[model samples]
Target: ATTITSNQTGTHDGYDYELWKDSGNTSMTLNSGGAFSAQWSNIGNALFRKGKKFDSTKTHSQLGNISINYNATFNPGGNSYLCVYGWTKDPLTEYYIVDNWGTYRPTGTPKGTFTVDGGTYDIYETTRINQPSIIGIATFKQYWSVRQTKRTSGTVSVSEHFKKWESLGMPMGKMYETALTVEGYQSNGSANVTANVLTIGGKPL
Candidate 1:
């Protein structure tokens, strides 16, 4: 396990993470059980992330399946979310699956409502071209999110969501790194996030 205190950036266990806080304090702990947890207070945005880029030529099936279980908590006066998003260098596209909690609700045109793993989500689609250069040049982002919901603890098969996006005409370009992030926004009190039971090809990571 790795414990990160103060505001800094580094890599551990082949993953990258940063503990950033606008005010007050933020901390992150990475567990051997594939769980990453964070605590923050009075923080405008505190983000903890793990990511690795992938080659673009591989198809989704070739990438296999990825799944994880997450438990996120946030105190009043702030918001927290667990998200998985990815990018492609050429053609510039991004995809997202966000499980939201507390006071944040993503803004986009609602595509539809659907259920997966016993939870309902309002799907949204939005396009953008001005992402940071590191994230690629242009982008079409698809968001699958659950709104006004606090504290989601469940298994998410992210590959399924990616497949759904593909059905909606998402391109299979060169796949950048996929990231799992726990974000804190305007956290006046306390915010925490945890993840475990991570699996790829049905095996633990």
Candidate 2:
């Protein structure tokens, strides 16, 4: 179990926003100056939960597009893909269960939106990571594919967990059981992707 600590540029120019010992069985502390408040992205890599990879062959719902801050450098002929997918209610037991992970294109020539068939899902965003790493390598980007069960809007409630961590000194548990993995392309069109053990699979389209 390792701990992650870092500082950030607060709303002010010089005054910094920082946190210490954010994970593990250790403690977490935030040092903020007066007149300025702080907020966490909640979408950082540190919050990655255990689940499975996205299957482009199935997805019944949508989790919106991937919002990126800093990008990675991709080798020529190779690509970097961020695969977002997870599991919801068991198809046999859960009646309200639905597959809510798909693709969303906001800009570029292929700007369009679409969903997969059946139940599983897999979508790929292939390109370069771009220059300067917009969000900082440490303060990297984060994304999620919500399992739309009841409504279109889905969120993880932190208020309860916040109190638990603050008072009991307990670590915040992941919102749900989901897996997201990023892979860099290889000469054989295969890349190493790390994800939860949900085991999402299907026929290629």
The prediction achieving the highest TM-score against the true structure is 1
Q: Against the hidden reference, what TM-scores do the models get? A: 0.74, 0.20
The positional error of residue 41 in candidate 1, measured at the CA in angstroms, is 4.3
Worst 10 residues of 2 by lDDT: 89-98
lDDT per residue (tens digit) for residues 2-71 in model 2 = 2223422222222222221132221112222111111223222211112222233332223222111111
In the range 76-106, model 1's lDDT, one tens digit per residue, is 4556666665666565566666765456666
Candidate 2, residue 69: the lDDT equals: 15
Q: What is the lDDT of residue 142 in candidate 2?
A: 23
> Which parts of model 1 are misplaced by more than 4 Å?
5-25, 41-44, 51-57, 136-142, 147-151, 189-195
Can you list the residue pairs that collide in candidate 1?
A: 53-177, 56-174, 56-175
